[PDB]
C-alpha cells in the first residue's frame, strides 16, 4: 500500500508495476507496462493497494536466497509527471506498507538469536 503525502492541490499519475518471479527487473516504463501494473492517480485517490498474488512454482517457497525460488520485482514509474500549482514545494514524499493475507501461512520453526 502506497500513501501519497503531498499537497491536496498537487496532481499526477504513477504506474506501480509487478513482475512475477524469475522475470528480469523492469527497467523501462514500457517494459513494466506489459506486466501486472496499477495506474495510480495522485489527483484523485491518495492511497494505492496492489495485492501481489501467488504465482509460485513450489507450493512452499524459500525465505532464503534461492534462484530455484526467487521473488520478483515491484517498481514505480512516472505514468505522467507531478503537477503542482502556484509556488507549493516541488518535492513531497510517499510511504509504503506491507502485510499478509488470510491465505498466508508458515512452517518449520527455526531461530536466530545471537549474544
Amino acid at each position, epitope marked *: 500500500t502506497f500513501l501519497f503525502c503531498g499537497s491536496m492541490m498537487a496532481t499526477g499519475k504513477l504506474l506501480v508495476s509487478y513482475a512475477p518471479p524469475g522475470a528480469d*527487473p523492469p*527497467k523501462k516504463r514500457k517494459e513494466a507496462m506489459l506486466g501486472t501494473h496499477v495506474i495510480w492517480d495522485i489527483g484523485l485517490q491518495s492511497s494505492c493497494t496492489m495485492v501481489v498474488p501467488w504465482i509460485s512454482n513450489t507450493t512452499y517457497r524459500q525465505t532464503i*536466497d534461492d*534462484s530455484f525460488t526467487e521473488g520478483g*520485482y515491484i517498481s514505480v514509474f512516472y505514468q505522467t509527471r507531478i503537477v503542482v500549482p502556484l509556488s507549493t514545494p516541488r518535492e513531497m514524499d510517499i510511504l509504503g506498507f506491507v502485510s499478509a493475507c488470510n491465505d498466508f501461512s508458515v512452517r518449520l520453526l527455526r531461530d536466530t538469536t545471537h549474544i
Partner: nanobody
Framework: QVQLQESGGGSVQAGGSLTLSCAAS????????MGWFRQAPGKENEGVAA????????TYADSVKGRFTISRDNAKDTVYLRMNSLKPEDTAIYYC???????????????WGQGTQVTVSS
C-alpha cells in the same frame, strides 16, 4: 552478509583521473548491477554511473556524462569507476551500491558502502 569495499578514493587534481572499485561479497555479482552515488559537503544523495553485470548496458548522469566511465568485472566481483577529467564539482563523498539493477535513481538500491572521500583539488 553482503560487503562492498569502496576503494579508489583520494584528493587528486582538477582534471586528474581517479578510478574507483568495490569488492562484492555475499552474492553472485551477475544477479545484481552496481552503481555510484556522490554527495557534496552538506548536499544530497546524487547519482553518477551504473551498469548491469549481465547486460553491461551503460547509464550515466547528465552532468557527469563523458568524463566518467563505469566498467564491471565478473571474475573479481568488482566495478571500476574511471572518473577521468575531474572537476571542482566532482568533490563529493562517493558511494557504491549493488542494484536490482540498473539505473541511477533516488536510492533504488540496498547494499551501501562505508563512503570514500574524493576531493578534486584545484
Amino acid at each position: 552478509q553482503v560487503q562492498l569495499q569502496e576503494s579508489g578514493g583520494g584528493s587528486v587534481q582538477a582534471g586528474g583521473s581517479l578510478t574507483l572499485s568495490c569488492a562484492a561479497s555475499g552474492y553472485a555479482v551477475s544477479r545484481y548491477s552496481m552503481g555510484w552515488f556522490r554527495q557534496a559537503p552538506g548536499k544530497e544523495n546524487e547519482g553518477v554511473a551504473a551498469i548491469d553485470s549481465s547486460g553491461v548496458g551503460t547509464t550515466y548522469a547528465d552532468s557527469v556524462k563523458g568524463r566518467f566511465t563505469i566498467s564491471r568485472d565478473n571474475a573479481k566481483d568488482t566495478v571500476y569507476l574511471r572518473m577521468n577529467s575531474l572537476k571542482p564539482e566532482d568533490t563529493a563523498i562517493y558511494y557504491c551500491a549493488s542494484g536490482f539493477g540498473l539505473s541511477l535513481s533516488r536510492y533504488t538500491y540496498a547494499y551501501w558502502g562505508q563512503g570514500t572521500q574524493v576531493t578534486v583539488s584545484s
